[PDB]
Design a protein around this ligand. Structure first.
Ligand SMILES: CCO[C@H](COc1ccc(C(F)(F)F)cc1)CSc1ccc(OCC(=O)O)c(C)c1
Lengths: 276, 13
């Protein structure tokens, strides 16, 4: 490894993605970890660990999406699924905004931009969800709430089966001990996968992903001295992300049909559409 | 025949 104008550009791209990632995403992994360990000056997430705490939390947590005027489901499982939809729709926009900051992305075929986003969004969602998870639960409502793994597992079928796979993945992924600087480049690599179905102008996409991939490896080598193979292990996780996405969609069909009290926001329908 | 009108709008602004 040398310090030459190539590496210097790599590091410059690294910083640009990071800066763009900080402004595009509200709750970074840096802050989530602090909250998750009390090492925070902010209040303290309200813990939802049973039905009584859920009910209480619905009052004492100001959810950005609910209002007293509107009426929501009578079934807690459905209400919780609704807030997750709202959060996912918001997540789609943060990710879209982040994508536009990736050098070159905006100058791609708009139709291909759409295709990269349709497929990358969910992988990036579960990637960044890990930042908010420990093995006990997950931060919600941008850190004002904390919902436990076991409480989510206790929702009536089939809802009690949606988050388990994500916790499973998060424990393995968080053992990589990535930080935001690593993550910023990683999700950029995900967005610019030239092997997504339906792409038309692949060449310029791979040319971007190659830069991203160089910038990532250099980032991992500089930032994780005591863990070789981190680059390979991380690429492997991109595989596992495609599997949990497939599985999530499939289970989502079990919801669909066999449920009717809720429906899927159109943005989410656009994405899940002709997915896998 | 746009199958992702919303995403398309999001990207256009
Ligand atoms: C990070 C913000 O927190 C959100 C708040 O969710 C709610 C929880 C409870 C309630 C209510 F109590 F009102 F029912 C509402 C929203 C849920 S966290 C989450 C969990 C999983 C997610 O993705 C997977 C999925 O779409 O199921 C996403 C995108 C977000």
């Amino acid at each position: 490894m040398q310090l030459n104008p190539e590496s210097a550009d790599l590091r410059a791209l690294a910083k640009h993605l990071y800066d763009s990632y900080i402004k595009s995403f509200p709750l970074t992994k840096a802050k989530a970890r602090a909250i998750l360990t009390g090492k925070t000056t902010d209040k303290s997430p309200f813990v939802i660990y049973d039905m009584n705490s859920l009910m209480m939390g619905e009052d004492k947590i100001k959810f950005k999406h609910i209002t007293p005027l509107q009426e929501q489901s009578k079934e807690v499982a459905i209400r919780i699924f609704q807030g997750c939809q709202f959060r996912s729709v918001e997540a789609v926009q943060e990710i879209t905004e982040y994508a536009k900051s990736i050098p070159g992305f905006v100058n791609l075929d708009l139709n291909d931009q759409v295709t990269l986003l349709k497929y990358g969004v969910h992988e990036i969602i579960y990637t960044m969800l890990a930042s908010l998870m420990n093995k006990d639960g997950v931060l919600i409502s941008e850190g004002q709430g904390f919902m436990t793994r076991e409480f989510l597992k206790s929702l009536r079928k089939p809802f009690g089966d949606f988050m388990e796979p994500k916790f499973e993945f998060a424990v393995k992924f968080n053992a990589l001990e990535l930080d935001d600087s690593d993550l910023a480049i990683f999700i950029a690599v995900i967005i610019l996968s030239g092997d997504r179905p339906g792409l038309l102008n692949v060449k310029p996409i791979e040319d971007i992903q190659d830069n991203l991939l160089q910038a990532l490896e250099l980032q991992l080598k500089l930032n994780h001295p005591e863990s070789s193979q981190l680059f390979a292990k991380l690429l492997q996780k991109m595989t596992d992300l495609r599997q949990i996405v497939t599985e999530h969609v499939q289970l989502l069909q079990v919801i669909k049909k066999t449920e009717t009290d809720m429906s899927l926001h159109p943005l989410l329908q656009e994405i899940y559409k002709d997915l896998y | 025949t746009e199958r992702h009108k919303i995403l398309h709008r999001l990207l256009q602004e």
